[PDB]
Design a protein around this ligand. Structure first.
Ligand SMILES: O=C(NC[C@]1(O)CCCN(c2cc(NCc3ccccc3)ncn2)C1)c1ccc(CN2CC3(CCC3)C2)cc1
Lengths: 242, 201
């Protein structure tokens, strides 16, 4: 059964036909999580170094133009972010790169900031609910684009690399929340930064920084107090120290 | 000449200028990641891919650090990467089958060279769902996507095996059974360049 031919015949994406305990770890993660902290900030005009301490995990979700088919950030803007100034010497990054030139310019970024790519996480979008919706292609595109990539980067010394959900409605720019589960399940540390998050993505265990946030509660010394001794090196996947 | 053609050879040493120009190139290279018939990074870079096309598309399978090295070769050979196919690997019941995450997919960079005219861009989408056959066997769906993209044109596969030979394609690999060429222009240029049927340096 050739699902590519079927897609050409019917408009049903091949991924429409994909089918489909230790969740104690999930509960450890939740008990480890710092209170949610968040800060409204125009990251273009903002001294990134004010965000202390250095982060174990950075989730970077710049608002690309391609997300608005029907302020956007160019890869020119993104590449100029001083991301290496706030990353811990051992740290991880998750960069949403879209599905176009971002797959190349995002790799340049990761190298610019001193990371190496260890994983390529694909968010594959099903169209079970609108097989009769054709895609207006990027001029350079050879194929209808039905996925987005989140690149994982490492610097210093259970889950699969796929997320499958239904294609969100036009104008919905949200990424699948499953990326957070993948990230948290790595147990990489508890200093977790989400750049370009929104009110709707605020989440325990995370510091969210973005221009559209309506409220802020970030205090650098309050934030640093969550990781002062004896809690300096917890993975996020262990018990609190008594 | 439409039916399948092939050349058992060391792709490092074959003079690919005898083969003419192709609307589509596919390569599935033996990258030097984490060896068997492996090519080093410099050998990959030095492959004379540039002579193979003037206007058309290259399909380049990549994994591990070849995701980046394949982008290097692609750009060095003169291509812009314009798409990236992923093949979600399933079993016969459509269930999905790098030390941080398990891998559910393989990647195929799509590069463009020149200004391809008359291709059916946008017919297929960039996700393949298909059953794993045997190790390092790519899915046959890619040939269908390529045929719908560029129907009836000449194509060439690098590092193919005998199961890979297809009509409209010339397959190169060191595990093919001899030479089998039917296109007269190719046959002529092959006899002229290789009067004794041997491919050495
Ligand atoms: O099996 C493969 N390809 C056939 C070969 O036949 C094998 C032996 C080598 N090979 C040469 C090598 C050559 N020169 C160098 C040389 C020659 C002799 C001694 C040492 C070096 N010339 C001509 N073919 C090619 C192969 C390799 C990697 C993958 C990865 N894929 C999995 C994937 C597919 C889509 C999902 C991506 C798949 C298939």
């Amino acid at each position: 059964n050739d699902y590519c031919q079927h897609f050409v015949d019917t408009g049903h994406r091949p991924q429409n036909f994909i089918r489909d305990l230790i969740r104690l770890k999930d509960e450890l993660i939740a008990k480890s999580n710092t209170p949610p902290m968040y800060l409204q900030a125009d990251i273009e005009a903002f001294d990134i170094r004010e965000l202390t301490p250095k982060f174990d995990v950075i989730l970077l979700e710049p608002p690309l133009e391609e997300y608005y088919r029907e302020k956007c950030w160019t890869w020119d803007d993104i590449m100029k972010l001083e991301i290496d100034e706030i990353a811990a010497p051992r740290s991880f990054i998750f960069l949403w790169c879209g599905s176009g030139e971002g797959l190349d310019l995002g790799r340049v970024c990761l190298r610019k900031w001193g990371y190496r790519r260890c994983e390529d996480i694909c968010w594959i979008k099903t169209n079970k609910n609108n097989p009769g919706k054709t895609k207006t292609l990027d001029p350079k595109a050879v194929f209808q684009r039905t996925k987005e990539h989140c690149l994982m980067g490492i610097k210093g010394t259970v889950d699969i690399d796929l997320i499958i959900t239904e294609e969100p409605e036009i104008g919905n720019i949200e990424k699948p929340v499953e990326i957070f589960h993948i990230i948290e399940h790595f147990c990489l540390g508890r200093r977790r930064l989400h750049l370009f998050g929104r009110d709707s993505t605020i989440r325990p265990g995370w510091l969210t920084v973005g221009p559209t946030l309506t409220n802020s509660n970030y205090n650098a010394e309050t934030y640093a107090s969550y990781f002062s001794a004896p809690n300096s090196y917890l993975t996020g996947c262990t018990e609190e120290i008594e | 000449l439409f039916p399948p053609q092939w050349i058992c050879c060391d792709i490092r040493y074959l003079d690919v200028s005898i083969l003419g120009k192709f609307a589509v190139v596919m390569a599935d290279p033996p990258w030097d990641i984490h060896p068997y018939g492996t090519l080093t990074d410099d050998e990959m870079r030095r492959l004379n891919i540039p002579v193979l096309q003037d206007d058309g598309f290259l399909f380049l399978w990549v994994t591990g650090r070849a995701m980046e090295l394949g982008r290097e070769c692609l750009n060095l050979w003169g291509y812009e990467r314009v798409d990236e196919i992923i093949w979600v690997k399933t079993n016969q019941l459509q269930r999905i089958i790098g030390h941080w995450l398990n891998h559910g997919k393989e990647h195929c960079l799509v590069g463009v060279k020149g200004n391809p005219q008359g291709f059916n861009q946008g017919l297929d989408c960039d996700v393949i769902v298909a059953e794993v056959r045997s190790t390092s066997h790519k899915p046959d769906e890619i040939y269908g996507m390529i045929e719908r993209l560029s129907p009836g044109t000449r194509k060439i596969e690098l590092f193919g095996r005998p199961h890979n030979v297809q009509p409209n394609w010339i397959t190169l690999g060191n595990q093919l059974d001899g030479i089998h060429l039917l296109d007269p222009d190719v046959v002529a240029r092959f006899k002229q360049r290789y009067p004794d049927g041997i491919i050495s340096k």
